[PDB]
Design a protein around this ligand. Structure first.
Ligand SMILES: C#Cc1ccc(NC(=O)OC[C@]23CN(S(=O)(=O)c4ccc(C(C)(C)C)cc4)C[C@H]2C[C@H]2C[C@@H]3C2(C)C)cc1
Length: 354
């Protein structure tokens, strides 16, 4: 099922890092000088939006060809830059004054880069979290204190807390993802202890991931998230403010609908749903958000689905330790889902009631 680079490590074609998992390892922070005008706007989005200067600034940009973005990391940075500018341009200050046409000198390079990466031309999780970070000190570990985001939308939008805590959850889960190949090898070799320890390691990492997730409350304010950050994560699919979608000037003639952010864009949920065998209007939206994940990660999720069932192997062994380790994994994953639902309630549904 899962293609392997060697006897120990999954194929590099899945673009999954041993240390940070689905996150992009050591993201590029600076683009070639050729793109300084894009970088300036993105680096100054807070003060450009607040001063009402962002849209005029974007409308004065020249056309910059994407031909000089010659590797994956520079293209991912550029997608993040152009995606943040796009959200800022469409929604503005978030009072209802929206733009229905994205200017061509952003829309064309953005859409071509999106085609290259096979991502939709709208900000997604893989941009604003998985690639939107850096280490303050390269010699220190991956901790909140030692990390920052590359871009925010508004001063006080809590985007650092929201994005970095999400990223640290993904990094915690990375230590579980790297055990997945060991789980399937242990099943094939009928290695009881190897499988038990793999399942206990996955459980322990997902439990840690929930403890990292708990940090969200200390770095994100519900009012600022609901009334500010949520705006720039909103899309134009089923949105009455952009009922037909957005016109990408110079790329498509007709407006096009693309969805805003969703927790379904994290590959962590489907990865361990499938691994543990615990995976329709909801099924259609689920599958759609899969298409908002990096294509290599979709392919990893598919290969996982092609393997034998961990759950049926474990429950056939009359083995309490194996079943308890399996159950600990399920419990951990359910607790992450349950916590996501709590965050949706405290940071969206409640603020909306008010
Ligand atoms: C573009 C874009 C865009 C921006 C951000 C996100 N965030 C995202 O996918 O986060 C995954 C989370 C889930 N949340 S959450 O706080 O419950 C959360 C709740 C609500 C949202 C939206 C609807 C506002 C987008 C996002 C997140 C944090 C993460 C922690 C754990 C649970 C999963 C996890 C990694 C396994 C998605 C699209």
């Amino acid at each position: 099922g899962i293609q392997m680079e060697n006897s120990w490590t999954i194929s590099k074609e899945y673009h999954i890092d041993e240390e940070v998992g689905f996150a992009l390892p050591n993201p590029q922070e600076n683009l070639p000088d050729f793109y300084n005008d894009w970088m300036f706007i993105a680096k100054h989005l807070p003060d450009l939006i607040e001063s009402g200067q962002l849209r005029e600034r974007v409308e004065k940009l020249n056309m910059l060809s994407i031909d000089h973005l010659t590797d994956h990391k520079s293209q991912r940075l550029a997608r993040l830059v152009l995606g943040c500018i796009t959200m800022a341009y469409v929604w503005g200050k978030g009072h209802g004054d929206v733009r229905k046409v994205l200017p061509r000198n952003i829309a064309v390079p953005y859409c071509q880069l999106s085609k290259k990466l096979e991502l939709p031309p709208i900000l997604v999780y893989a941009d604003c979290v998985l690639a939107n970070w850096k280490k303050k000190d390269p010699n220190k570990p991956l901790t909140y204190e030692n990390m920052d985001v590359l871009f925010s939308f508004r001063d006080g939008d809590c985007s650092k807390g929201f994005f970095l805590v999400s990223l640290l959850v993904e990094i915690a889960a990375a230590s579980a993802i790297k055990v997945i190949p060991t789980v399937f090898k242990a099943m094939q070799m009928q290695e009881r202890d190897t499988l038990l320890k793999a399942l206990l390691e996955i459980a322990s990492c997902l439990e840690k991931a929930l403890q990292v997730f708990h940090q969200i409350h200390d770095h994100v304010n519900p009012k600022a998230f609901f009334s500010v950050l949520r705006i720039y994560l909103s899309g134009w699919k089923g949105n009455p403010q952009l009922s037909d979608g957005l016109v990408y000037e110079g790329f498509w003639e007709d407006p096009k609908e693309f969805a805003g952010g969703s927790a379904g864009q994290s590959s962590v949920f489907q990865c361990f749903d499938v691994l543990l065998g615990i995976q329709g209007h909801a099924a259609q939206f689920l599958q759609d958000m899969r298409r908002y994940m990096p294509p290599a990660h979709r392919n990893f999720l598919c290969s996982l689905e092609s393997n034998p069932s961990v759950r049926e192997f474990v429950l056939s062994k009359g083995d309490a330790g194996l079943r308890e380790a399996y159950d600990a994994c399920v419990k951990a994953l359910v607790s992450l889902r349950s916590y996501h639902l709590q965050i949706v309630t405290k940071y969206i549904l409640i603020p909306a009631s008010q």
